[model samples]
Structures are given as structure tokens and as C-alpha cells.
Target chain A: KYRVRKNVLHLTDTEKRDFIRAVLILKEKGIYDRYIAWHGAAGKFHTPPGSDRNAAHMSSAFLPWHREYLLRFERDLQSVNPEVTLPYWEWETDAQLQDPSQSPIWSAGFMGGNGNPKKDFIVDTGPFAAGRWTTIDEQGNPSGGLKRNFGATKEAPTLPTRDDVLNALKITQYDTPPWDMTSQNSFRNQLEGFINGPQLHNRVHRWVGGQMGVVPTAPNDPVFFLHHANVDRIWSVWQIVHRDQNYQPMKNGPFGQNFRDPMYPWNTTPEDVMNHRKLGYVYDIEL
Target chain B: SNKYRVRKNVLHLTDTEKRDFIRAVLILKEKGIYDRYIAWHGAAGKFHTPPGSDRNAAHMSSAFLPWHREYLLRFERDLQSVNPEVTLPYWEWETDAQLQDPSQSPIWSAGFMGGNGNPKKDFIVDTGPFAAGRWTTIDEQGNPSGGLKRNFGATKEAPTLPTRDDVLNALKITQYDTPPWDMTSQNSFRNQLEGFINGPQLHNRVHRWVGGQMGVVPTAPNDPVFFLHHANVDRIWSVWQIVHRDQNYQPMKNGPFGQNFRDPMYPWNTTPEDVMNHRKLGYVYDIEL
Candidate 1:
């Protein structure tokens, strides 16, 4: 069974060390490098144009595909440190940190502070800072370190407030057809954060900026895991709340694969991941 | 004096040229002309078609490319009128994009477009020359306020700027546009360059890159960088014409109300025919394709 994954900020000294150690191990083993390369190609794989994943991004499968992507990667991470579970970033709580880039997570002790102005904005403080742990893009170009731009360029950039999270959870439907950035009223779409609702997911990405701003190479940033962990938690909780409903598209087409059909690479399907326990991990909090 | 009226990377601009370009923009601001362009761009969801569109989001549906191309051209002329040597320099942002920190780009300095706004103040920009009370917003709704604010790379760090190969890939697109030449049309190069279809949010990404003053539709043009960004957008379109000679505009399909190749673009009183040939428009790239 999946062990409880706690909020990263709440992780004790040892858990934090374990998490950092596991990431470094993955980096050394080339697994981290491999995913960066795959994420770059994901957009193309999902859709030759950007719309291929429109369904996945804006459609019902938005939650499932992400769940699958995370699950696959989580298992990969676990292979390095069986005791390690991906930590979820609690931005609502982290907001207390004020300057996200200036947070402890961005400190020399953790992910590293925002990219240094002297080095092309490559992160200069964190464990994975360029030179310390550089990454490569899809085209095979390489950089010295990771990048980050916390808070908006604004003096006090507004991240998703606690209210935004509440508003996101309040929505109900997972998605509507022609699911894309424009889908309205979809709990998934709202959570995806493009339209109407609190702009949950999208706003966070915006607030983080840089590699996090870019969709593909975003995973290169170690912070990507913790961030998505929280988003994934949102879907997990939504599933529990909307238990009366089911993952939509229950079909096999461009929008998404049906429940029975195999999702490529995984050889498993959304039906396989509908329940969080299927792959064996659960959240620490009640959500 | 900028020898090449041709658009090139922002980094490529000479110091003298950069200073002159800034001067021209300030002059436009003094004349109250810059805000008008922004209002035009902002007329969407509701407002005047001439001011731009997506009127009721209608224009965003059918002719976002033609409309914006024309808008950029007009702004270029406005700048040129202030200084014959002034041409909107393109911010080939992709080159800067490779950098880890976007705000570090020379373009964001006190001399250039400036950094993001102050969150404590409705995101009013307080950096560089355009900061605080210097650069104002223009609303299609007529309720403009505050200073410039931007959340560069809103989601992740900025995505790598679209490379030539990215553009080359878009050029491979055979159809100029399909039915619904609006934002919804996909797999069509017209829609691709207009910025709806391509992988990374090309045109939209630029807006996101500049957030605050330029992120939203209604007041996007309020920022002077808007001209340079849009100029590049226009330049990319010109590149597409040269790459795929045979593919021009989409022909009218089987529907009475459908748009045709020769139809007059709304409010412009000019058809796509008038805008297709860049050379005829009286401007050509300072740099070659």
C-alpha cells in the first residue's frame, strides 16, 4: 500500500533529507534526465499540435492522465528510495512564506533560491542549481542549473489565496466536451485554472514562473513534483466528493482513452488509476 | 539612427537605436496615441469592432490574425511618423528564453520594458522607466488605471521562445487556414501563427511572458513592448507567406455566411487581398528570411 505523503513544509528533518537524497540519486541514475526529455516530447505525443492534450488538459481525462503521469514517476522515484513518497506542496499554507522564491525550500538547504540574475536566471541556491545539477531541454540543449522566478515580478505578487482553493473545491463536474482551456464550469477546468473559478492550478504555475511556467521542462525543476502532488491531491479529493459521478470520455479516441483500453506506455488504463490505492499511495491530510 | 528599418532581435539593436525607439514611444504617450491602440486591442468580449474585436469575442473567432497584423502595421507607422528612423524592433525572445531568469533579460532593465509590477498596488509596475505612474493602462471599458505589472513566465519559467525550427515546423502546415479561420481552427498554419494551435502558446505565450499590462486582451497594447511583440508576430506571418508560396488564404467553403478569401476584413474596409502581400504594404524586413 502507498504510505502517507505529507506536506513538504511539514516534513521532519529526516523526511526532507530522504526526499532530497532520493532526487539526487535519481539525477545521478539518469532517471531524472530521462523524464525531462519525455516531458518535452509529451505535448507532441499527446497532440501533434497543442490540442492533442486539449482533451487531456481540459477534458475529463485531465485528472486521470495526470494521475497516471504522476503515478508512473512516483514509482520510478520509489525505486530509488522505497521509503520515499512524493511530498505535496501546500501553497495555501506556504503563502505564509510570502516570497516564494525566498522560502526555505528555495534556500541553499533545499530546492534552491530563484535563479541568480548573473546566470541566466538559473537557480543559484537550491540543491539542483545549475552546475550543481543542470538539466537538458527536449532539443538536447543543456543549461547549467534549474530556474525559478517566485512571486510575480510585481512587488507582492498574489499567489492563489486560501479562498481560491475553497472556490476550486466548490465546483462539481470534472469537464465538458471540447475540453480545452476554455471549458467553463468544469471542476477540472476550474481547477486546471484557466477560466471562471479560482484559477487554482494555472495560477500557481503562473505565480511560480520560469521552468514552472513552461509546461514540458517544468518537471526538471525538483519543485515540480511537490507542486503536482498537491494538484493530484485535488483530483483525489474531487473523486471522493464527486464519487456519484465517474471519469468522463469512458471512450477511446483523441480526447482520451476509454477505461477498458490501455493507456500507452503504462499498459494500464484510467480505470486502473481511478482509485488512489490501486497504485498504493494516499495523502496525509483529510482532503 | 537605426540603419535597418528591418525588424531584428531586441539584443541586436544599437544603443542609439534603442534610445531613439524609447523616445518615439514616449512621444506617442504624450500624444495620447498609445492608449488608443491599446483600447483598440482591448475591444473584446464587448465593445467596438474597429477598436479591435473578439467583439463579443466574435473577432477572436474569425480574424484574429488579419486584425492584429493590421494593428501592428498601423502602430509601426505611428512610430515612424515620430521618427523616420524608428521601426519596431522585434524581441526575438527565444534567445533570451534560453536564459534561466527571464527578468534578467536586458529587455527588462530600467532602460527597456522594465520588470513586473507591485502586487501590493493592484500590480502597478514600479520598476525601470515605465514603473509607477509612468506607464498607465487603457481600458476598452474606459476604466483604465494604475502602473504596469507583469508576471513573466506565469506558470513555469518562460517556455523556450519558439525556435525557427518551431516556425519551420509551423511552415510545413499546408493549409493557410481551415473553416472557422477564427481561434478554434486547428492544424492550419493560419491558426498556428495567429497563435491558437502550435505546441507552446506562441502568441499567447508572449502575452503571458509580459503579464500585467499586456497579459489581458482589453489593455494588452498599453505597454510599448506590445508593438515590438506584435511586430514579430507580423514578421512571422510574412515568413509563412515566403515559405509556402502556393498556400495563401483559405477559400470559402460550402456555406452562405462563411468568410471568403476576398471578403473585406471587418472595420478595416480592406479584404485579406489587401494585406497578403507584405511588400505592397510599403514595409519589408530589414533582415532576410
Candidate 2:
């Protein structure tokens, strides 16, 4: 249980086994559906009715919301087997591949390979391939088969480099007012890849495509956890780099830029999750 | 000139028209004309606006709407100048909006611009006729050497390319341009149509959806698809103009984007208002609502 989390690429054999076992636990528990149900658990302030207001997917609340949500999911994993900590998938490596799908990350040993061309969305190989694993689709309903068209095509582009991450970190203020998507020079917006600020977090979801392409059902895919694991890692990286620039907002904004605002159920605000130590988990390679 | 060059959607392009459009780009590329606009888009050295307006002739601002229109106008004329039968085609991106993966779009297939560039060769594209070896563009570093790169939806989050409903909302906006008249401006028809304010998304969202070469401003026009895209943006402007003809491009106002209405554009000696009438420019879109 005391194991400091490491990168998926850098995991030891024992850690990797635990990681896969934990993922199976998550699937077997069907915990993703329970969590995904929060997306439709709309808050009163949301527009266009019943979107991920509570979950805060695309808004300013996204960074912190996901941070808190990941913690909750992490705890669920720990409960099944305290030995299994979530490992982060640094997709940038696969990005550099001429054929990224060929990477071991997509192999039968790992997350599994791409789906077949005919209903190709079904994970043709990997631990989760067959036997009709049921989970939520984008429509907010439960369905079977894991869908990922990795490299979705050869044209699938490489991810942001370390240099790009460094550039994103250089921005001082975390986010500004009206902090939905238009907040200028915002660290949150940049990290979220809104208005094309280095285009992080959101890209990997699209690169994974299918269920991950659309937000509501993204967590249903097991890779969603690992991808978000990397995102959480990037947040840790950002937090350390901009410790002095820890700007956050009030408790009651509609879009949740507010640090004081409770995201509910757990009732923790953005400020609560800013430091991972308070949440009681730290990466092995802590920045 | 054919007098009334109705720019049609890429979907409506006759098979021969598509071939001719690509050929026109190649002809311009060979003659260094296409690269000029690409260079203009970059604005490091060449293609700056006239009379010390700015080093770069165009991009991402209040004037972003009209500037590209003027650029497309000149390029459209140039295409006609190459072969009068060649008119620009608009890629109706929203048609491909629901596509989970952009590379799957026929637009990236050989008949159109090829798929994304492989990173193994510095993002040199090798899918279609405009393969890595063949169709090259000026990279973001301001060098004309490599094939086009597209990491569509890779970096930027494509929030489902705007639907026709979004366009209709955009058309309903009463004002042409408003305060702070730039990418951040809201309620202004120009900014909204430019995809800054989220109705009838153009400009940025499309750039994000079609990533890589198309994403970066300097290297954006480097790809020939940039022209097709700008042509589509230009078409939206034309359609918006027809629907909301009374509310013309914003005149000089007290806020930041004042004086942009008549700011001298490059190559051609016209202002934003000067290019308003597409009929006067001898081209219009053929799509209805």
C-alpha cells in the first residue's frame, strides 16, 4: 500500500502485475459505471441541461475535478487490492512511434491492441478484448466491448514534447475570470488544451478515439484510467513548478474555478486537492 | 473571369473540379505564388500588410475575418488566373464533425489532402498524391522544405465541430462586430463566425480539429488545405453577409479593434468594407441555408 506510483513504461514486473490485476478488479467491480453516472448528475447552474456540471469535464473545474475524481477511483482500486496503485501511461512515447499501436502498451500483454476493422472498435487483442465487458458509451448508457482505434490512423500525431510541457508551465496565473474556455493565458485552460494552448490532456483522449474521443464515456475504457494517470502526473509536475503561482477562485462559481467550491459527495474544493500530500498519495518520481 | 464564381462545398466538387483545384495549388506552388500566402501567414519576413499596418498581413484578430477574405479573394483570382475553370472548394468540416477520428475523413484521402504526416520522417506526409516526397509545405520554423503535417484533434480538444444549428445561431446575431473586436470578442457576428465565440465555429476550432500544419498560424497556410479552409471560412462570411446584409463589417469604434474596417490590406489596395460585396469580387457561395 505504501508503493509510490511510477510510470507505466518504468514499472517493475511485480508492480506491472499488480497494475493489470487492479485494472481487472476495476472492470470486475463495474466501478467505472458508478463513477460515470456522475457525469449526468448535473448541477443546478449548468446550461443546455444535464451535462457534466457536477463532474466539470470541459470547464475551468475540469483540472481539479478530475484530480479529485482520480483520487476517489484510486481509493476504489486500493480497496480491491491495496498493493495495486494506478500506473501512468506516458502516451508521448507511443506518439513518437512510427506505428504507435505496435508499442507494447497496445499489446495483448498490456492495455490491448486496436479493434478489428469490421466493428474494429472491439479490442481485438489484450486482457479486455472479448467476453463482452459492459460499460458506459458516450450517450450516458451502459454497453459492451472496449473501443479504441489506436493511432486511429497512421496520421495520428505525436504528443507534446517535454519542451512543450515546460512552455505551458511558464505561464504564471492558474486561471482568470469567466474561466470556462476563454480565460486568456490561463494555466488551467492551457493544460486542458482549450483554445490550443500546447493542446495537452484532451489530445490523448482523441488519440485513443472511440469511447475516449467523447468525454461522457471516456472513463469506461480502461486506458482512460492510465491516460488520466498521466494527466494527474502532469498536474503534479505543474503544481511543483508553479508552487508560488497557486492562484484559484471562490467557493460558488457556476463553472468551479473557485477553490472553495465543493464538487460534492466527497465535498472537497479545488484547493483541497492542490497538494497531493493532503490527499495522501504521491508519485514515485515526485517533481 | 467566369463572372459569378459560386464556391461550392468540397462534397459537391465534381471529380474533375477536385483534381483541377489541387492542380491549381500545385501550379501556384511551382510559380511561388502559393508559398507567398503561406509566407504571409507566417509573417516573419514576407507577406506583411501594407503601409506599416503590421509585419504580417493576416491572422487571429478582429481583422482576422476580413483579412482572410481578402487573401482568399486574391488567391481565388490567382486560381482563376492559373485556369479560369478552377474555383476554390469549401470543406464543410461539420459534415465530418461526428467523426471520432479525423484521419478517417475522405478529405484526408488521396482525392483530397492526404492523411497526417508520419513523425518518423519529421511529419512528412506519405499517404496520397500530396505524399511526403511530393506535396511539401513551409514548416513552422519558417522553412519551405517538408511535407504537410496534421495531428488533427491530437493536441487541441475538438469539442465536436459546431453543427448547422450553431451556424444558424451565428446568423441570428444582430451586430457585425463589437468591443475589443478580436478573437475574444463576443456577441459580434464577425468574431463568432471566426469561431472565437463558439457559434458556427470557424477559425480556431477548425484549426484544432485539423491539427499539425493547419494548427499553427505561420505554418497553417503552408498546407494547401489552409486555402480550402479559409475559402470555407470566407464562404461562411459570404453566407452570413447575405443573411445579415444590413449590419456590415464594423466601422472604427472607441475600443481596441477600431480603425480595422478600412486598414490597408496587402497586395490589393482595398479595405474590409471594400471586399464586402462578393458579387463585386465576382464570386459567391452556391449553398442554401
Candidate 3:
């Protein structure tokens, strides 16, 4: 509860600069590449090889895995600047706007604006503009600049609404048997946005195109962390609402998807990070 | 062009061969390609066989031999990028076991992998190409830490390298691998050569004997000899395969995803079956000739 993660809009101008500076420092020091490689590795690490489930996505471990991922990222940020904590991008609230692209989160001072059509869709504004930020391909090799196409996809032209999130929060169980994208009545699957296919979390990735559009290369964009923080915050709210409910597949689930299973690419278990508050950090809303 | 690249013994490598190999590796390191191998090896080590189990994607499982075989193959390919003539050499520690002090073997010379860590400098290797200042080391977290260190035969449990008799004994097993295909699988050729049988008798013993970064699975690749070490391990497996031509990989259908004969290994799409035949992979030990 000591470290408070704030909403991106709630953050002051100085706080935003500090967060961006810390991320840039991590990038320069080569620490940031580790996260990119981790995410990419986990994506390729299919839980059962042939199964659609991976160590980090399309499975029950998705929530807790990303939770641990963001936690470690927050710590890395702190390593660069102790004053900095990860800020979330609340896309649901941004959806209320007639032009969600005009939201302060995409300001020239922060994560930057949409990809430029003239420049082959490369990001051309703000701190993470084309030349400012270097990105890597799925192969882990340097692959030019960051790019984004806000609400570009026909399937996900707009962000998920507040009611969409509320509907997902109404789910009672943390997860269900066959704890994957297909699991019915599963809060994990619902929030993962695979229940209806590219509905919420999945939709957001499509909304912010380019690197964020793909699972392996998503982290190449800094906003990937901010977007995930919002998903994580929503998860926190769900945990609080369903206080009695616990992580599922306590037994007989896939190797890395079970409650106590040691997640691939890292040994940290779901049970290890189940109680986010005990992890010594809380979202600003919890205050 | 030759059909198969002959991986020669480290002891038999000419002075130019050693220099070329070392130079190629250093170039890979400078180009940031060497670290990827280290990162990949470390990444797979934490991926436990069945979550919460001691077995992992790379070690303590039936895939141990095949995993490292593929790992070495990839590393050798990268090395070949720097020097086409250079092939990965095997460190036959079993042969070194005959010496009065194994550390004095040519493999540990300053020209080769370097001697043991300095007693005064906390056992950090102060001699060879990968000595403290010459080669920077990365911690488990991927950050550049400081220097490479090695304390050879420091542990009482692994004071000596596995002998030739140990290698011969492990090769006697006919079965490729047994059920529950992990470190505990009895009469398992995979587990036996993996050195988990009667506990750390072959492949694992050399790691312990070398100590330092070599002693741990995740950081072992940091030490250049890791490839050479696994090359020997692969050689032993090759010998076993040649003798037990009728015996094949175990649990072809029912083992864990990555460990199965046909299932693809993590970090690469290559399966155990793809690398089962060493000669077909275009490589053979010089001893074979």
C-alpha cells in the first residue's frame, strides 16, 4: 500500500515527465529490452505446445502473470527514479469523449499521438517519436521506430465503455475449468476480452495499432504498460468485489496456469502475487 | 564441402583453432549476439517441467540432452557467422580427470578458458579471455553486473570430474529414457548421461567441478566453456545412440509438451526428433572418424 499507482489523467505534469524519463533511462541501460524479450519468450512458450494457451496469454495465468510483469516493471521504474510509479491509461473513461484521440494521455508531452500516414505509420510526435524511441521486431533485433494507429481497426474503432468493464466486474468466479480463452462464466476469460472475441482487453490492443496490435511485440510501445496497468487496476477492483473468490485450477490445470504453479520464464506463482496489497503497492482509487 | 562438421576435442585443437574460436565468441559478444544465448538458456531454466517441480524446460528432464544439443547447435551457428571454419570444440573433462590436478589441464590455460578464479579476488577468474576485466558479466536479471568468476572444484560434493568409467557405465543403458521422464527416471539413458543418476555423475559433475558461473544452470552459458561442455555431453549421447540403434526417444506421444520426441522445444520450433540424429544435423565428433 506504500506505492500508489495513479491514473494517467490524475498525474501532474511533473509526475508524467518523471515516469517518461524513468522509462527512457531503463531503455538506454538495456534493462527495458529484458521486458520485451520476456514478453516475447512467454508468448512463444505454449503451455502445452500445441494448445492455444501460452505462458502469458490466452490462459488463466494471464491476469497474475501480467500483474507480476507490471509489478516488476514498476520496480524497474523505481530503480531509475524512486519518485516514479506506473500510471494507468483508463481507456474506458476516455471512451466517453466524442474524440477519444484528443485525450491528454496522447498529448505531445506524453506517449505521443497517432502514426503518421506520410511516414509509413511511424509515430511522429511527443517523447516517443520515431527517432526518439527505438523498437525491436519479434526476433529481438532492432527494427526502427514506435508506431500507433489509434482506433484504426473496424473491429475495435472505439475503446471499451465503462459499462463494459462493469459488466465484466459482475462476474463472480475468478476462473473456471478448462481455464483458457474458451472458459465459460470465467471472469479471467471475460476480462481478457476473449469471451466475445476482441471485446475489451483484446479490443484495446486493436484500438492502438502497430506494435501494440500484436502480443509478442506489444511491449515495444510504452503505452503497453499503461494500458495493462488499467487492466490490472480493473482486476484489483474485481478482487476486492469478489473477496471470497480465489484463483482457479488449484489442481489439474496446465503446468503454469494453476494457482500455485510456477509461471514460465519466471518462478513467481499466482499465489505469490494473489494479494496485490501485500505486495506493498495499491492503486490510487483504493485510497 | 564436408557432409558433417567435425567437432574436435578441446585438447586436440591447434593454437590457431583456439584463438579463432575465442575471437569469434568475443566478436559475437561485442555484437550483442552472445548475450541472447545466455538469456535464452536462463529463460528456459526457470520454466519448470510441471510447475513447482525441480525439472525445467532445459534441465532435470528427459529433454536435457536434446535441449542443450539444440542450444549448442544455435550457438555454433552464430559462431560460424564470425568464422565459417570454426566449429564448437568439446571439453573432454573425463580425459582431464587422469591428471594430478585437473585445473592444470590445457582447457583451463589462460589461452583457452583461463585458469581457476583468484583466491585473493573472491575466486573471480583473473587470467584468460573471460577474466574479470576482459569480459563483462550479466547478472540473472540481465543487467551488466561486473566480471566473470570461476572457483574450480571448490565444492566438496564435486571435488573431482566424472571419470571415463562413469561415461562408459552410463552408455551401458539400452533405454533412451523411462517413464516419469525426469531426474528420477531409473535406467533412463537420458537421465544417466544427464548425470542425475546416482546423482550428478557425468554432465552435471563437470559443471560442479568447474564451479562459478559454470556451476549454476542459468549462468553457465556466461562461461564460454558451456558450449564446449555440452558438446562433450552431446558426444556421449551420440555414442549412446550409435550403440543403441534400436532404442529411440521415450514418451513419443505422452511426455510434457517440450520434452516429447515430436513436440517443439521452447525458444525454438526445433523438436527433439529434429536433433536426435547428430550426423544428420551436419555435425560429428572427431573421435568418430
Candidate 4:
């Protein structure tokens, strides 16, 4: 059996200086290069060139693609130091209070402190407007009359509010702190929340999605892994909280069943996820 | 008419029998049989394989099972080929939890210890029992007290088996074709009544076919297929883990080997023993190996 090297203990500090130094060492060793390359090619929050504008496909926007991306990152990390496993940050616990600014895990450069706000922040609206064009018939130019527009321009021109993104990620309910807790009783609040939850929210991005509006793809694009590491971290956290929920729900819903379900695309099923103990592996829980 | 013929009869099992057999096999896992067995060997500090020996590399390089039983069964099959109408028998490991005692294994006490006792204890095989007039000690037994041995008649002939390279070629051809056998679409299950029918079915079929050709009932102890199958399962889990990393680990643990199941010790890197050891063997299986 393989054992994790004890040297990893020296690398676990959450302090900014130590984190940066560790990251810089990893970067110098070309450890983060693959992620940089992948992010450049496929991590864009915006739609890449030659994507279908009319199709309602958010396949690239969220979980599935990001999952593959992170796996590649993990594999690379393992290749360098088989004993040194990847770690994740759980942002949801902090996001629930809408106050991740205080978490040591998010300290600048490590996660939050970059002075360049433009590169550090992102505004995403690609999903709301299912990338479709409206056809207007003109006398001479019938085809030219059609205008392309993302679905709902009324919601917001930039990214949806953090509340909306959380709603999209299925992280928060309308009754949560970030949303007006008092408004939870309102019909529109409840109705909008249901309509825009993961089911529809995910579809919206699939249809009209594009690249993330923030940070360039680079080894230092701290946002890349921090954002994804948080996502990966959230999965471990989710499993702990929702211990009763099936890894893959049995009810097929509108999506096709089996590994290809649009909701969950992979060759593995819920039963397979049940036995992590047998696989000779595990992950970090602390952010 | 022969005692050997009766042993061969034990190999065949119908579909219904296979289910029951699989259930028994799963019990071994549930009872943590492999963990206990390997740990016992480790604690004793007995060398399962010689230091720097190529068995680890050979096992890793092969396709899991095909190369493993080839030699064991090959000799049996060769003997049977002359007899005609004779088929090799199989012992279903899943039939019962494996006995910890060395003498309990069928092969260890079969009496055909083929090698010399000068350096290490070895037995000889008497092949004359199978052949009409010819007499040869074609089998060897070693480590009888340790539950390791060879059966058949004794002989000075060296044991023969497929090389690691041969095993690799077979695995590549079977698993990496344009449409690999391991993939789902290759064998559709739309009408299959049982959920366990796919992967396990293919696995057993491979086991029997490979073992029959080698003329021996493949044992997890002797056969490499045991590790290969687990490796394939590991590959599938790795992919799933990637997709669902966002879901978190479950049954939360806090202490070492933490209560949180998703803790690093649970999902990505758990126990040193769990992560480091190969299936039923001491060494790790390298991707290249």
C-alpha cells in the first residue's frame, strides 16, 4: 500500500505568506502549467469561438466540464508528488453569510487580495439569455433582419447578483440571508426562486453560455483553482451535510437516465460513489 | 473413473449458481478478508516475493488474469488434451471465505511437491498418474506450511507461464480497441434483468476462459486477474470522483481516518495501507507497470 509522505505537513499553512511561497514554489516547478493551459483553452467563462449561438447548451458552463478540468489538475499534481494530494476550500459555509471576505482561505493572491479588481472580479450573464436570435423580415434583406440577443436583458447587463449565482449553483434558497429573508413569503420570490433553481438555471447557461468575465488564464490566475478548489471542496462538504441524498438521484426526471443524464454525465452511478472506502483514497475536508 | 476427473467437475456453474457464488465472494470483501490476510503476512515479515524480484513488475504489466493462470492451467490442459473429453475444473473462491490455514488449500496438500528441499522446501509432481505408461514427476510444491504449493506430478522441468509482455498485449487489445469490451455500449443491457450482470459477468467469463486454458483453477493468490479487475474499478471511481468532487465526502470524520467520509483521508488519500498496497499483494501497481 502507498502512504502519504509526512513532508506534506509543512505545506498546509493557511497564512498568506506561506501559501504564496508554496504556490510560487509549485509554479516555479511548472506544477501549475497544465491548469494555465487548460484555463486558456477551455476555462473561459465566455463561449469559445465557433460555439453554437442558437443552442441551449450549458454543458460547458458548470459541473461536468469543470469536473474534468479539476481532475486533470489533480492528476498533474499527483504526478509531481504522489503523496501530496489536492486540497479544497468550502466557500458555501461562508457564502451563506455573504461574508467570505473574512476567511483566511480567501486572503489576497491566495484567493481574494489581488489589487487588480478587474481581473479579480467577474460578471456573468451568458446563461439568462439562451443565445438565440430574433428574426425580422426586411424587404431586401430577410435574413439580415434577425437580431441575436441573449434571453432576458431586463434582469441585469453584467453577472447576476451573488444571490442569483448561488441560486443558479443550487447553493441558496430564496429564504436565505443573502436574499431578502422577509421576501421569502412573497409569491414572486418563491416562484422566481423555483423557476431559477438548478434545473432551469443550469439549462440557461448550457444554452447561451460563454467565458467567465474575469481573470486571464495563467499559473497566477489564483481565481482558477481557488474558484474550482472551492467547488471541489464544496462537493466534499455537500456529501457530509446531505449524507442521505443519493450521489446520483434515482428519479431520472426530464433528463435521460444512466451516466449520460444531462444533470450528471459520466460512466459511474450513485452506487459506485457509495464505497470510497474500498478505493484506497479520500480528500481534505478543511478549506 | 479418475480422482482428478472429480476435481474438474467442480468448475462449472450455471447462471443462478454464479449469483450465489458472487454473493459469497462479496462476503470476503465484507468480512475484510484481504486486509486480514495481507496484514498477517506483513506482520510476520515473510517475503511474499523475493526482494527486487520481477513478480511485481510481471503482475503489473499483465492484463490481470490471462497471463496469470496460463501456466498453471496450461500444464493441466496439456495433460487433459491427451485424455480427451476432459475439462479443467474451477474452485469458486466466492463459494466461501478463504481458509487462513495453509494446509486447508486444495493445491498445498495434493502431494505432488516437484522441487528440491535443499535450499527451500519443495515437492515433486507425479505426472505418470495422468499418462498411460510414461512416468514423470512433473509438479513441485513449495512453502506448504505457508499455504503455498504446486500440484500435479513432480518434474525437473521449469515452470512455464506467459511473460509480462504477452499479458500487456492481450490487455491492450481487449480494453483499448475502437470499441473496448469494458465500455457500456459494447454489451447493451437494455433488457437485462439483473444489475450485476455486466462487469462481473465479463470478469468471470474472462476468469474461466483463461483458467481453463491454463488447466488450473485460478486462485486470487496465484492469479494476477485479481488486481487487474480492481484497477479497472479504480479507474471508474477516479472518473466519478472528478465529476462529483463538488458534492463533498460523507459520514464526516474528525480524527485521523476522520469521521467525515469526505475528509482527505476518506475520498482522495485515506490510509497508508489502503492507498499504498496493491490488491492482495504488497507492492503498488504503477501505471507503466
Q: Native contacts retained per candidate?
A: 0.00, 0.00, 0.02, 0.00
Docking class of 4: incorrect
| Interface DockQ of each model | 0.01, 0.01, 0.03, 0.01
**Superposed Cα deviation of residue A160, candidate 2 (Å):** 3.0
lDDT of candidate 1 over B162-240, digit per residue (tens): 5556667776887777764456777787667656664346777677667776777756777777777777777777877
Q: What is candidate 3's CA lDDT for residue A189? A: 91
Candidate 3 lDDT score relative to the true structure:
0.85
> What's the C-alpha lDDT at position A43 in model 4?
25
Off by over 4 Å in 4: A1-22, A29-31, A39-57, A60-68, A78-85, A93-103, A106-109, A117-220, A237-287, B1-289
Q: Which runs of model 2 end up more than 4 angstroms from their true locations?
A: A1-3, A39-54, A153-156, A264-266, B1-289
Query: Please, what are the lDDT tens digits per residue for candidate 4 over residues A204-223?
Result: 22211222222221223343
Q: Scored by Cα lDDT, where does model 2 land?
A: 0.65
> What is candidate 4's lDDT per residue for B216-249, written digit by digit as tens?
2222232222333333333322233344444322
What is the per-residue lDDT of model 2 for residues B101-156, given as tens digits with 9 covering 90 to 100? 65687778787787777777666677776776676555543344556676656653
Write the residue-wise lDDT of candidate 2 on A1-287 in tens digits.
Answer: 34476777787767777777777776554344445544423221231123333335556677777777778778878988887777788776666677777776776777887777787577767677756456554433446667877545443355655665677778887777556567787777777776563267766766777777665567667787788777778877877887787745563455334676555323467878888777777887873
Put down candidate 3 lDDT per residue, A119-204, tens digits, no spaces. Answer: 98899999888788888786555677988888878888989999999999999998887888889988889989998778889999
State the DockQ, from 0 to 1, for candidate 4. Answer: 0.01
Q: Candidate 4's error at B216, in angstroms?
A: 56
Q: What DockQ does model 2 achieve?
A: 0.01
Sort order, lDDT high to low:
3, 2, 1, 4
